Design a protein around this ligand. Sequence first.
Ligand SMILES: [Cl-]
Ligand SMILES: [Cl-]
Length: 280
Amino acid sequence: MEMEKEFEQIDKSGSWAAIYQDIRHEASDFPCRVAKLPKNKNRNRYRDVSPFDHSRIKLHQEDNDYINASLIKMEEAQRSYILTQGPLPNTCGHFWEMVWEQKSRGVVMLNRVMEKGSLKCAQYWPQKEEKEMIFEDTNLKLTLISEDIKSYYTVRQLELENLTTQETREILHFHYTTWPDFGVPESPASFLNFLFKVNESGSLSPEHGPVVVHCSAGIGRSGTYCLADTCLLLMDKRKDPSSVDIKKVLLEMRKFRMGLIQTADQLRFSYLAVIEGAKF
Ligand SMILES: [Cl-]
Ligand SMILES: [Cl-]
């Protein structure tokens, strides 16, 4: 296992911080003019995390098309992802409008709504069957149909209805609920099981739009999920599976959204998840 040997070499050298800073230095820089317009100030959760203009998702209704979300198109892996921030109280209607317009059928959430007493995301889906949500700005209704609550993740069956046309769609909400409050998981086992459950659900089917992935900023935990999923896809396809270079894959994803993988510990965990998932 070449990656397992390079991993052990990086560990033995204590050079995760060094590799991670090289990634930061080598990462693409593209404009984010739309994100920074005055009229979009209250659409961004974090002033330092913005979508590039070239890859941002545009909303189709007529007054303001902006959402803090990026299309990551991993051409060789043959999968696209939408990475987005945790919705704000005023952007939940936009979030579901994006889900509708992009034809997504899965949402991957990697945070709890509150962590360490701080809010990471608005409560953008209904917790009770009988208390559906109506987004009057985007004319959508969202109902909780059922959920399967497990020890380390929950999968919810939501019904999203376009109130204009009365069309309905089933959306699966894949909520990883156990990422630690600080740092990364000690073992990737639970995270891998979750990733495989998302894949097995039929959500990443090329018949549907891209999966929507978020955490609080849509770059750290979300970057780890995207990076691990993309590397596992490449290994399951490439003639030489050991030729998958995780640093190069990450730099490719960073052409589409800034800041993906926010710490050297996230980078090490991504390597560890890919190594362990490849064995599986
Ligand atoms: Cl403006
Ligand atoms: Cl960064």
